[PDB]
Design a protein around this ligand. Structure first.
Ligand SMILES: [Ca+2]
Ligand SMILES: [Ca+2]
Lengths: 323, 323
């Protein structure tokens, strides 16, 4: 594809998460809809309430299939509000969907929904994962045989309310030269229902190996954690929020510190930018979204796909955002 | 009794929750112990980890039976730390123990533990109650056949972190003429596993029908909620924290407004004061605690009991504290 292709024109789907199951490419995006709520700093206008599942056979010219709703807030027993960016992993012959959702105390937790097939209806557990907090989870099937979750999100994601997995009496956002908050990493146990250990900082560093500062808002982690593997190297990509960038870093292990490299996606139409990187049929793709069909409305996002290409030195060729 | 009696002089127990099951008197206190943790503002020195159960047939001079440990943190699947003031309720031929415990995020939640007998080991549920927060729960079997929970606790109890059951970005403690934070009340459902509704405030008014102010620390709610019914009137008693008082209020229904009456017990030796009021064999008793055996060590408390009498107008005779 020479030009970015919009996949679902009929509805507003955001925060795409693409995976390859049974030689098919499945997408697990959020579902944006027009709630009657005006914009807000706490992100109340992001009032998604369900999940659809899309699948393709050919990303570039292929037909896109809507499998319909597979999960909604009503079906979740511990549900409060706001189903945000989710992710799916395949293990033990089953598919585990990890969704963020404020509990009945308006605290962001992460729940698990299970299905026997990647597109089939997901049945949620009655309670959120023990110790879970914040949002935007990413589930990475590492080569060591284990499955790792990467989560975290500034501001509306309540990540600043916590220090070392423990909630603060009062939220605290680091400023200026102070080290910025890191995204979190935690290993999941085999049944994929709970954490196997305590989550820890996924350190993102300079080229000098120094932790990114809070003022460095063009490189500092904000949200949208994602992890993939190419040419014997790890790639941790993410969103920078108020600078509207999708950056990426590199490392040699799922835990070890990741060193910032560059920018994958320049600012797009809309305040938010969210993504997922996956290889399909020999080519890499950067699934993401912008607010072009909604004519600039941030809370109404349409998912799209652009071809991602690497340089021989391992770096990623920057992709132009719409804006 | 012509002088208050200690019940477990061999160990350190606090926050007594006295009930009458099978013509016996059962107490469900917290188990203080020297954890090696020094005193600090967040109350880490209150590091209780297990529950004992005590029973008597005669309060004044009868033998107190130590039924041993019936629940410990290590058995709770969602365990974090600090098992604080709990209470038990009898329904459906079973005994439900409602215990407060910080989750793996140091957020105070309330969980349910079930036993077939008032002293037998309570098997805890895998997850805390949905929407639960703060601590010091008190279950009340009303005459309507329903069951209500009265929870809430300031400062260490994390009540100020919440407004209308929703977590604040930053904790807020009201001051001066502002209306003080009210304790909470919620009707449990039939299986006693979850809430049947949204928790509401239990308003405590003055003699002018006006909400108690935060500056009025000698009367406003702090912790240690307790509800009992005597001669057509309800009696909501509680602790006042830094004024070391236990006061009580009167109402006509479990939800309705309660009007402040007076002080049940003046400051005792130690900072904390906690209690439970129950009638046993024609006599009313005020179960509580102080730190006389521990020579003033606030977090090493010892249970004690004193007879409580009423005036013909319905008021409660003030009991003199050790301090
Ligand atoms: Ca994502
Ligand atoms: Ca109590």
């Amino acid at each position: 594809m020479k030009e970015p292709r919009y996949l679902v024109p009929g509805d507003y789907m955001a925060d795409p998460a693409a995976h390859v199951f049974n030689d098919k490419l499945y997408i697990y995006p959020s579902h944006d809809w027009e709630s009657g709520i005006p914009e807000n700093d706490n992100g109340d206008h992001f009032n998604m309430k369900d999940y659809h599942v899309f699948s393709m056979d050919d990303v570039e010219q292929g037909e896109v299939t809507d499998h319909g709703v597979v999960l909604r807030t009503e079906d979740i027993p511990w549900a409060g509000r706001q189903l945000w960016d989710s992710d799916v992993a395949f293990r033990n012959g089953k598919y585990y969907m990890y969704f963020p959702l404020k509990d009945q105390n308006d605290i962001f937790r992460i729940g698990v929904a299970i299905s026997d097939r990647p597109e089939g209806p997901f049945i949620p557990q009655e309670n959120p994962i023990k110790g879970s907090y914040s949002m935007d989870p990413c589930i990475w099937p590492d080569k060591d045989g284990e499955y790792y979750m990467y989560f975290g999100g500034l501001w509306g994601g309540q990540l600043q309310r916590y220090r070392n997995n423990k909630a603060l009496e009062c939220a605290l956002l680091p400023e200026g030269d102070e080290p910025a908050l890191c995204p979190k990493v935690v290993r999941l146990r085999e049944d994929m229902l709970e954490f196997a250990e305590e989550p820890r900082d996924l350190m993102i560093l300079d080229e000098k190996g120094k932790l990114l500062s809070a003022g460095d808002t063009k490189r500092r982690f904000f949200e949208a954690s994602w992890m993939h593997y190419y040419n014997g190297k790890y790639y941790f990509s993410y969103s920078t929020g108020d600078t509207h960038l999708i950056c990426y870093a590199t490392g040699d292990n799922p835990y070890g510190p990741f060193t910032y490299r560059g920018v994958i996606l320049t600012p797009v139409v809309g305040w938010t930018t969210h993504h997922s990187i996956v290889e399909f049929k020999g080519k890499w793709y950067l699934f993401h979204h912008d607010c072009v069909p909604s004519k600039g409305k941030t809370w109404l996002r349409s998912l799209k796909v652009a071809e991602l290409k690497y340089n021989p030195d391992g770096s990623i060729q920057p992709i132009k955002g719409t804006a």
